[PDB]
Amino acid sequence: DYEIQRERIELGRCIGEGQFGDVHQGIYMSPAMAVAIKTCKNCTSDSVREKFLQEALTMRQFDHPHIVKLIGVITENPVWIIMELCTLGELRSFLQVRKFSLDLASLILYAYQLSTALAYLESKRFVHRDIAARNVLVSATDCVKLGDFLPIKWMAPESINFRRFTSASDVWMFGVCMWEILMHGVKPFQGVKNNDVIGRIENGERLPMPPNCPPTLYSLMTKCWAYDPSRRPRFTELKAQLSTILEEEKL
């Protein structure tokens, strides 16, 4: 039963917005848990409420430690969706702010954790289409999660050229996200016109080996960027390889 009594939610400050309304942080109490509360300004309009609540119907289909969880809904007006809160916010910003305090083991851990979430999505034949550090959230310094699911500089060539999004294009995007993480939130193709990106890819330019990147991690990234999608790994392999690489760095 996902219905929550409104009296168990204390609305806190506005932390963001979505298409339907402001997003707040708050507390979920019982006879206390920090949560995110998505609101729907015009939820008295039946068609708007329906579309808003579809986001909750979607998220409850996923159950994974590195995907943001649906906690519940309040379906009386004002209609709210209660989600897990990732208290440290967007990963890209976190990496930029904390770059001189984050060790390599932490960066590899984030990549590993994301690969577990993406292997889970792959197991459901769900294509994400928008894997990038700005779409990852930080739950704790040792925990990142995927939440709330054109980004040309992240896209596979077949996505740019033909609008094709597949499990293999997600792997390309994950490769770019891994690069972002190892570079502490530096944007891929910084300073490059979006229109010039596909030209670089088709000339075999790839993002460079980040400082301190283990050799086997960078060749893994390189495989994610194989031009032919059939030559890219799947997430089961990525997860296994990242686990080994993480263990190597911790020891």
Q: Which residue ranges make up each domain of the chain?
A: 1-85, 86-251
The answer to whether 21 is a known ligand-binding residue is yes
Is 213 annotated in a binding site? The answer is no
- The neighbouring-strand residues paired with 74 are 80
Is 130 annotated in the active site? yes
Q: Do domains 1-85 and 86-251 have the same CATH topology?
A: no
The reply, when asked if residue 17 is annotated as ligand binding, is yes
8 A C-beta contact, residue 218 and residue 206:
no
Which experimental method was this entry solved with? X-ray
Q: CATH fold of 1-85, please?
A: Phosphorylase Kinase; domain 1 (3.30.200)
* Nearest residue to 149 (alpha-carbon basis) of 88, 238, 232, 83: 83
Report the distance separating Cα 89 and Cα 23, nearest Å. Answer: 13
**Is 20 among the annotated ligand-binding positions?**
yes
Active-site option among 1, 46, 103, 130: 130
Query: Are the CB atoms for 69 and 63 separated by under 8 Å?
Result: yes
What CATH architecture does domain 86-251 belong to?
A: Orthogonal Bundle (1.10)
The span from the CA of 225 to the CA of 233, in Å, is 10
Report whether 84 belongs to an annotated binding site. yes
Question: 18 a known binding residue?
Answer: yes
